[PDB]
Each structure stands twice: as C-alpha cells, then as structure tokens.
Nucleic acid binder design. Structure first.
Lengths: 83, 84
DNA sequence: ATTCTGACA
DNA sequence: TGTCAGTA
C-alpha cells in the first residue's frame, strides 16, 4: 500500500517528536535501542522519525502512564505488528 | 458446541491447578486480585477452576515469565478478548 | 489433609 | 512473592 510507505517515510526531527510525545530525548533513544522504533538518519546524522514511529512513541507514553513496564511495551507493540 | 459448557465447568481446586500450571497458590490468587481470572466458588468459598480458567492461567504464566507486569497483562488480555 | 484471608523479624 | 497464622 502507498499508505504504509507514507506512514514509513522518515521526516520528523527529534525536536517536535519530544514536544508531542512528551518523552525525553534519552527515553526516545532508549526505545530505539530496544527495537521499538527505527528512525533513519540525515546527512548531519540527526535522527528522522516516521509517522509509525511517532504513533508508536505516543502509544509508549500512554502505556507508561498506565503503569506498563518495558516487558509489557514490547509484547504489546509486537502483537500490534502481528495484527 | 457442547464443549464450552464443559470448559466453563468448575472441576478442580487450587491445589490441582498448581500442578497443571506450575503456578503457586499466591500467584494464582494474586492474578485473581487483579481481575485476570474469575474462578467459581463453592459453599465453603473454595475456588473451583474450570478448563477455561486453567487456559487463561497458562497465558498469564507465559507473559509473567516474559517479564510483563500486571498492568501489561491487563492491557494485553483486554484486547485479546475483544478482537476474536 | 486442603484452602482461605490477611499481613510482614 | 514467600510464608506463617488461625480458621473453616
């Protein structure tokens, strides 16, 4: 689908992503290091997130607020990719 | 489908369940405190688990071993029960 | 013997 | 969660 390719185009910088998700750059990096999201990189090596990335990050923020731990986050996001 | 009635049928007590799921009574009862399971009761308030409860209990064990906490499991089971 | 609820040297 | 307690 042209949709999935659109939802995957990397274009969002860490700056807005932090404002919207309310996550620290540190946390964002952490979820990336755990394979939860996959932000490509520019020429300046700056991170560029995709819509699916930001969408998942908003979900991570939400699960955190509900008390879900890292293990939970992983299971859920994984079972979402399998849906 | 006279199977569901048999699966939702109270047959074994906490002690047998422990043997079928390798879960302690503390754990088994604890998951109940979180609304994860709804075991039927007898006249003596003794829990009688059905086949459905044991299955739903094996699921919890899998996640529990995966490091998922109660909040995580509530979140997971909540969806796995509304989709199918 | 077996399970139950509450509680924490 | 373990576990000891005091029952039912």
């Amino acid at each position: 689908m042209s949709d999935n390719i659109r939802r995957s185009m990397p274009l969002f910088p860490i700056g807005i992503v932090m404002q919207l998700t309310e996550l620290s750059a540190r946390q964002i990096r952490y979820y990336e290091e755990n394979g939860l999201i996959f932000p490509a990189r520019t020429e300046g090596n700056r991170r560029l997130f995709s819509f699916h990335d930001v969408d998942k990050l908003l979900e991570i923020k939400h699960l955190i607020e509900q008390g879900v731990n890292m293990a939970g986050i992983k299971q859920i996001l994984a079972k979402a990719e399998a849906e």
